[PDB]
Every structure is written in C-alpha cells, then in structure tokens.
Amino acid sequence: QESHEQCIQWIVKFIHGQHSPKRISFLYDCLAMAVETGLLPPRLVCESLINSDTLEWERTQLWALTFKLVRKIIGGVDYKGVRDLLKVILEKILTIPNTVSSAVVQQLLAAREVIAYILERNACLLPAYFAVTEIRKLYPEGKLPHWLLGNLVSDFVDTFRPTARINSICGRCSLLPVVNNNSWKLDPATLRFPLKGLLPYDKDLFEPQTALLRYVLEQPYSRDMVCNMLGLNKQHKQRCPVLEDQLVDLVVYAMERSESQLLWQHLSSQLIFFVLFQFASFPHMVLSLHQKLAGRGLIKGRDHLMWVLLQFISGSIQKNALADFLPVMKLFDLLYPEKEYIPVPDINKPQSTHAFAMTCIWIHLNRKAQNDNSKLQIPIPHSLRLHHEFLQQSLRNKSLQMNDYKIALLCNAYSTNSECFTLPMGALVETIYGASGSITPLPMNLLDSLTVHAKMSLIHSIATRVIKLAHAKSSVALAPALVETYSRLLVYMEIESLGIKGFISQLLPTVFKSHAWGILHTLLEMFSYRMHHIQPHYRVQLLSHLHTLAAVAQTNQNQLHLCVESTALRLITALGSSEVQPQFTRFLSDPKTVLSAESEELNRALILTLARATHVTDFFTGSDSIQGTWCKDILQTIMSFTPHNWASHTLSCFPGPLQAFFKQNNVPQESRFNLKKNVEEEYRKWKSMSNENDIITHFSMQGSPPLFLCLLWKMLLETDHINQIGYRVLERIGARALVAHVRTFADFLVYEFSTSAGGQQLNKCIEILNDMVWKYNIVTLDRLILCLAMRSHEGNEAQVCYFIIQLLLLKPNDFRNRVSDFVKENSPEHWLQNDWHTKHMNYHKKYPEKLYFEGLAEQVDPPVQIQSPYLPIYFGNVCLRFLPVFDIVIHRFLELLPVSKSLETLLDHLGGLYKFHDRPVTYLYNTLHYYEMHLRDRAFLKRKLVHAIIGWVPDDTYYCRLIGRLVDTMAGKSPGPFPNCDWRFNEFPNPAAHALHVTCVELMALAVSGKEVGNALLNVVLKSQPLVPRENITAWMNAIGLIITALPEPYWIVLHDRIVSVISSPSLTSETEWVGYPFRLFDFTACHQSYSEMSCSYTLALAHAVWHHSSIGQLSLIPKFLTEVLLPIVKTEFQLLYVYHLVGPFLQRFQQERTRCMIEIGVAFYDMLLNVDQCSTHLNYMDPICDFLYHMKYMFTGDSVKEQVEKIICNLKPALKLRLRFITH
C-alpha cells in the first residue's frame, strides 16, 4: 500500500537499466497492457515514469519510449492530476538546450505529441484555464517559448485574448479621478494595475501608470490619496524608489515648463512630506536629479529649484548630518556655471527671495560646518560674493523697515544662527506683539516669501507667548494682529507638527486647564471665522472637545456658551458628504464623545447632516434596514439624552432606513391644552405672591417645567413692563438652562399664533416678540429662530411657525439694517485686508451686542447695574452667526410647499449675506441634489436660489462646451477655463473639483428633465458632432462619466435604456456569420466603424467609464437591471458576448463590496447562456464563453453557487455539457 509506489519506481528503474532497445520496448509494452487492464493506478504510473531520475535527453530512445507510453496511458487521469502532469512535463522540457544535433530531434517530438494531445480542446481532459495559467506561469509575458513547442504554445495562449478582453476596461489608462481630501489602487513595486489571474492581457496594461501618478501628485492635498493609492502605511521606512523617481520627474517637468508661487509651494510641500515620512532619501533624490539634469542644456528654473531645496535644507539642517546635504554643491556647480559675478536682484519684488536661495543654502551649510568643526570646510562660491556682501551689509545696518524684503531675506538666510536671527525676528514680530495697539497683521505676500524654518520660528514664538499669557492669569486681551497672523500662519500644511496638531492637541487643552476663558474664546472664534482647510479628524476631535467643554468645567456664562454652541453647529453643518462615515466610524465604541447631552438642536443638526450625506453618497441603495450599519448606535445614543420627534414633511425626505428607525422610537408630545393650563396656572401663582426669595426659589428651581419665557410673554402682553423680580429670575436661571425655556416658548408661540385673530392681534404679538429679541435682549435672534425651525409641528401649525420666522426676520428693521451695513462696508477676502479691526469696531460701535440682559436691567423702576466683564470679540457678530440657521430655514421652507412664496422674499431681502458663506457652491450642490423631487416642478424657485447665493431648451453646443470646460481643466491649460484661485483659502482644493461642482449646479438649475439632460450628455459623444475632436474621446467619456455620476438618479438611469437600444440593434441581432471573434464590434479603437458598430463600441466604452466612476450604491442596480430587463431579450451569441463585455470587468468591485450582487450576476449569466443555447442552432464561441465562465468560478464566485447552476448546466446541449462538466465540482 504505502510501498506500492516505491515498488513501482524500483520496477521502472530495473526496466530502464537494460540496454537492448528491443527488450526495453517489450518491457514497456508489457507495462502498457498491465496499465490498460487496470493493474496500476494511472496517476502513480505516469508520475513514476516522468519523475524517474534516470530520464534525460541523452537517453533519447528511453525518453521517446517513456513519452509514447505516457501518451498512450494519459487518458484516465483526473483533471487536477492532469494539471500537475502538465506542470512537471513543462518543467522537464525546459531543460533541453537550444543547440541539439538533428539526428535525435525527431526522437524528442514525443513530448510535443503528448502536449498536443493534452492541449486539444475537443478531448477536454482538463479545463483550458488550467492549461493557460500553467503555461503563462512558466512563460511570463514577452518570453519566447521553448523552440520545440513554438507555434503550439503561442496559438494556445493566443486563443484566450477574447477572455482577456472581456475582463478588461476600455480606455482604463486614460481615466483620471478628482482628488478630494479605492478603484485607483496601484502596485507599489512597478506601478502596475493589479490584474486578476494569469491571462494574456493587452500590452498597455503591463506598463507603469506614470501619467496617473503624476496627475495625482500635481494636485494640492493629494498626500493621503497618493499614500492610499500606493498602499503606504506609516509604520516603517519603506523608501519607495518609484515614488522618489516620480517626484524627481515631477520636479524636472515643472522646471522644463518654467521656460507659479502656489505651484512651487505645492512641490516644496510634497517633497517635505515624503522626505519626512521616511518615503524618500533627500541625497538620493538630489543625486538622481543631478544625473537627469546633466547635459540638458538651457535651464532657467534654477532659482525655483534651489528655493525648493532650501525649503527642506533650512528645516532639517538642525539635526540631520552634514553629509546628506553635500551633493547640493555639485548640483550648484552644474546649474550655475558662470564664474564671473551674479548681479544683486531688486529687493522690492517677491522673487528676490528666490534669487537668494543658493546664498542662503551656502550660509546654512557654512554654519553647519562651523558647528562640529574641523573635518571639512565649505569655501565661499566665487560667483555668490555680492549677495553675501549685501546680506552682511543689511545685517550691519541697525535701522531697517518693512517697506522692502530685507527682513524676509535676512530671516531666510540667518534662521539657523541664533545671534544673527534676533534682529530680523524682533523687527518682524514687535509690530504684531505691540487690547494691544497692533491692528495690522503680517502681509500674506511677506508670509509667502519666508521659509519653512522662519514660519516655524514665528509660530513657536506666538504659541509660547499665548501659553505664557494664559498661565499668567492676566486680563489683557491678545493683539488683534497676533490673532490674525496666527490664523494666517496656520494654513501651511508642512508645519503640521506645530500648526494645527499642536493647536488642537496641546494649546487648547492648556488654555482649558489654565481657566483663561478669554484666550479660549479668542481661539474658538479664530477657528470658527478664519480656518478654511482642516483635516476631518482634526475637525471631529475639536467637536468632541467642544462638547465636553460645554458639558463640564462650570462654563455657566452667556458668551462662552453661545460661542461653543455656534462653533459646534458650524462644524457639524460643514462636514463633507464623503467624510461622515470614515470620521464617525472611529467613534463607534463611544459615541457620547462626539454627541451631546442637552443640545437637542445640535443633535438634530447632526441627524440632518447624516441624512443628506447618506442621500448624496447613495449609502442605503439596495438596503432596507439600519441594523448592521454605523448609524444605528449613533442614532440610539442620540435618542438617549435627547428624545425628539420629526415632522412629517421633514421626515418624508429621509432615506428609508432613517424613516423606518423614526417610525418607531416615537416620543409622546405635551398637549397644547395642558401647556396652556400650566402657563395660566403659573401666571396666576406669580401674581399671587408677595415675597422675594420665595419667588426666586420657586421660579428658578431645576426640574420645574420651563415656562418662564411664557410667563414673561404673558406679563408684558397685558402690563407692558417687567419687574425687578423677572430680571433676578432670568439671571438666576442661567444661559445653559434657558435653552429649554426657549424650546417650550417656541411651541407656546405657535399655539398662541394659531389660536388668534388677525390684524391688530398679530401686529401687537410680532411687535412684542421683536421687542423681546432686541429691546430687552432676553434671547438672541439666531438661537430663537433655530429653536423655532427645529420643531415638530404639522400642517397649519408648521405654516404658522414658518410665518412667524419670516415675520420676525423681515417685519422689523433691526436685522435688515445690520445685514445691509455689514454687507456694504465689509468684504469676504479676509487674507487681503489690513483694516478689518477698524471695520469691526465701526460695526460694533454702530450696533452694540448685548448678552447679559442689559436692556431688561435698565428698564426696571429701580435701575439695575450690570457688572459682568465681557470677553474680547475679534471676528464674529450676529450676521455671521445667522448663516447656518438661514441654511436650515431654507431647507425647511423648501420642505413645506405652501410657504414657497415666502422663500423668494427672504432670498431677495437677505441674500447678500451669502457673500461671506464658506462653501456656497457646495451648499447649493447639496440642496439641489437632496430636494430634486420637490424642485423638479418649481423651476422658478431655482435660478433664484442659485442667483441669490452665487450670482428655453439648450442645444447640443451648450453641452459640448460644458464637457469641454472640464476636459481642459483636467488636461491643464495655461489660461484655464477658470481663473487662478487660492486653494489655501477656497472651498475647492482643485480646479477640477471646482469645475465639476459648478457644472453640476448649473445642470441641476436648468428647467429641463433629468432624462433629457442625461440623454444630451451621452449624445455629446454617442452622436457625431463638430468641436469634439477624436484621439481625446476617452477623456471626453471620462468627463461625461464624472458629471453624470455626480448627478442625481434620474440623470444617470438613461444608460440602461441606451444599453437596451444597442442590444436590440440589427448589428447584434443579425445572424450573419463572421470569421474570427468580432473584435471590432466591441472595440472603440478600430480603423473604420461604419455607424452601427461605432455606436456599439462607443456605448460599451461610455458604460465602462460611467460604471468605473460610479459608487457601489449606484452599481447595486446592475444585478436587478440584468435580471429584469436584459434577461428576457438576449437570444443570440453576439448579445451574450456583449453583456459579458459590459458586466465582466466590474465583478472585482462587487467581490470587494457586495457579494449577493455577485452571486445574482453569476446566476443571471448562466440563465442567459441557457436561453442563447436553446434559441440558437449551434454555438461558435463555446471556447470564449467557457473560458470566461471558468475564470469567473475560479477567481470570484468559487463554489458559492452550485445548486442554482446545476439545473441550468444539466439542460444544456451535449457540446456545452462536455465543456462545462467541471463547473459542478
């Protein structure tokens, strides 16, 4: 049993020991007949004869006899064994030398005979996929096969190109993404697309994706995306040579194109990041750059290149060894051959800093050589003598101003030195150090001229001063220039260790622990009103800090509570759609960190942000349950600490899982009758008391229902004044506890207004409400309006509530005057101004802000003196605080239909305040995407929402221009479809993102249907038109796919109709026979495509682009489309192959995200094959179809589906049954 194989091998070598050819042949024949009668297992006998150690091509007769025997006895082996025998036979035959005498060549064709038999498809001993994968594994792409086999192996590999084409995307190398701070992953070894299986793919798919990587690297804030793309984890010094080479080539490309400041800053930042995170070696990049630039010729970008090098040399020279920075001298020798003298540039231009880069580099190198002295000294370059003399003379002069860039040059040159750096730093920082008297911050152009080391020194000084002042417990406010300069300096991302990570992780906790409450308020206001680009995790971390600060530390002050509430609301509302899930999935363990205990308004705002993000991202498409998702625990813990109900109109727009969650978890509501009875009883009890302490204790007791604002309304409705006791109760209750009183006052106001007359009875009530807001300063306008708009009324009550909001906003002059003045005397580009503080004092002096009930304190029969000191205010006011509330009010007014007319008046009167909005374009994009069903009929409501915030059937030229704008934006044009914008301060990091969002907003604002918009967008390519040049059609398809994927569902659903129209076309329906595979039918890069095959190929390519740019939720409709629409209309092989080409390449995505869809797709493919087999007389592409099915089972599906496919396979015709017999196993 165990020794049978050993005995067989012993008999084999005993037979092989003979020398008589006739005797050997007779023994072989005897073994052959013993095998054919079943005396020996075929696997064992073939393995023994082939793995016998005595077999060698010198024994020609023995080799030939053994191979004819294995050919005779090879037919009874299971396919796994057959595959192993194929592998060992190729391994053995690989050892044959190229030069062999022809006297034995005919004797060594027995191996070719057995390989020919085993690779015959008709016999079907094993699946052809095993044979092709073994052959490809032994012989990779581009390797010429062994001369004995040649054409056999070549053509056998050549018969799998149809399968390799099915499993490939059309024009994949020319599809580019949009970088926003997945499907674009790349191999970190050779920049290859990860290809599944060993199939003979196209040649272009085996080349590195240098173009794609370069395009990604050219965009700002692409660091995280490129790390994710290349699969780099911040855990070890990977030191990617490919990444180093790409960075060097990008620098060379930029210098060649030099023949702006933001661009060079972007490169300097990219090199800084990649050198810091142990992904590149600076000396290695310098040496490679030197080799690449040697013998290039004209080089005009030397100053910019040396500035980029200085940005790292100055920062890292403090600790890094001097040997690393040595090759810079050789690079200077190459790029600066002049040996005469360089003239000193004018010091009145920003370029002066760039022109002094080499002198600064040498100064730093000389200083480093002066430390740890001896070894080697760096002599003065002969050319750079005038520059050194100029710097020395500038340092010698003790009276130097900021009119020119002498300060910047000295700071850049002498940053490393300590003694020579005090004078320029003092001259630069005293003006902002000096509330202090400094009002003019450092200019943005001056800041851009400085180096990274100078910027870090400036921020370190500012942070140290802030910490020292906070620890000193001094009441002096910070310098407005200092705050503005800090806000400006916190934009650069290369200083993350000190800029924003140190601002959030250390500075804010230190100020919190120091009990400053003035520094903390200034920092929070600065974050709210001056920070533009913050990483999402930093934003969420600060949101958690804000929530815990509001909860604890006894911050029972009106101003601090208001600042925390407003800041938290702005961060919650400003979250991105694609960022919510990754940011909130980290807090899955403890949602209470990112949630709140008492701010029902903040929790509801978070819920609304959740709903809009899930709607835009199509997270819930294909699902009808909330369990198993990340939203479940967050919603449950929101229901804790905050039970609330959602109105019908505001709940009907939520996704299905959200609606299902909120149908249950319903909270009972206090009845209006009981509310009115309680208010009347509290008023009668208030008027029945005569003491003072008893009233204060009774009406300020915690746990009593919050009815005191209702009592204030009831009092001054009939007596038109408030006693001193009312002020005492308001002071005692506290700002944090007044929120519940405002919340109940909202419902009481709605009930009272609904149950009231018209005319005088409303004019009086609205005048009372306006007086309470402004004259008495009881409650602040944005808080009141937010609490009104966050209610849960129905129908008539909802109309009354929104009417109250509109009347409170527009009827009096108090808010309109403030908005008009702020808009008329202020500008939003805060980084280009010098007198913001003077404008701020002007506005605040004209309109003072009251937060401690000053008006009510004054209007008491004995006047009451308020002695609560104010925290400093630097940036914010009521107009800027009202913007998120106005966004929410717009959303509610859109949700309710009868109040659509009031929204037009509100926009016409208060639309100028959006000039100060952070992300107006993104806000409109989200608003139009979310409310498409509601606004698709009210076309006039749009063009009014769009015109107020940013500011006829179009022909084909309009759509062509719209696509071409994004095409040229992605390509890169010197004029550009859009003017140059500062990505450090704009909402859009890239012109591509800016153009995409603007185009989507413009398309959604049109008064035409989504079907027409989508059909026209596809028709731009699918119907021949002028001004659509060829040879760039792939990027046109890329732009169309991007736009249509960003567009809502009624816009990208037309692809299914287009696909069906192509399926039912005569090109695929005709029964005309073709020679060979119809390659040109499915290939868009063909010579001449008539019209019908042109339409088919272009439709395939457009579908590939759309489904490559689509999300998984949008891809979830493909299985249902395939099962319901395409299944009963596919009857021909051409249609079957077309569907295989359509859906084939995208199985990998389904495998990674959604498996049930993959199973359904496989079952649908098998049913389609059965339908085609039944309808057609015979099958001509059995081999491609079976190869694709085997590849599917062996790579994606596995043995997952067997029961649903056995019945289908058993009903096929005998030829297909013979081919597909191994799928069942």
Binding site: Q318, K319, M456, S457, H460
Partner: peptide
Amino acid sequence: PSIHFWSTLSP
C-alpha cells in the same frame, strides 16, 4: 530652542 521639523509645542 532649536526649531526643526520634528519639534513640538510641548517643551
């Protein structure tokens, strides 16, 4: 008081 890339606000 060296200020490099690998420094932090905490002394």
